[PDB]
Design a protein around this ligand. Sequence first.
Ligand code: HEM
Length: 149
Amino acid sequence: MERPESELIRQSWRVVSRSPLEHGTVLFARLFALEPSLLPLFQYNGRQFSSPEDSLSSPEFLDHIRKVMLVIDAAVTNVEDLSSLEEYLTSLGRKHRAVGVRLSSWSTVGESLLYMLEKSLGPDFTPATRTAWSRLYGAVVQAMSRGWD
Ligand code: HEM
């Protein structure tokens, strides 16, 4: 990730980072709207969520969203030199393994992240901004993939 894209990522993330659960709530609502077959992957207290709105009522799931947003925040923090996060990201890929699932739906999660950013930023979601985030997301998924394999 080069310099120009890096300030773009930082600037755009500031808004998000002020209310991470409200934003991650959009990401996951979008995710389950696009691919409801991912809903059963998130099971707490020996229960499957029936509908996407059920997931938003689960404190365990909302806490999961906060973890996701904290990891994206760590990626933003290290956007200039990710290799600093490489080991952690490989360990995160290992975690998915695993608990049970592949990362074959990585693009859908990526499009849900970009959806949340588009909706939050509005006119500030420039072509340059989208491209920067797509590349950052791609870099994170690659490190996680090294994890998993
Ligand atoms: C490729 C599609 C993905 C799927 C289907 C998926 C699904 C899941 C599932 C089922 C869990 C376990 C939930 C639980 O039992 O609480 C999980 C954990 C997690 N995921 Fe994802 N995930 C994907 C990609 C990602 C990406 C791209 C990131 C971040 C950039 C991410 C960050 C996390 C974090 C931080 C956890 C918690 C890890 C821990 O407890 O140590 N995931 N994911």
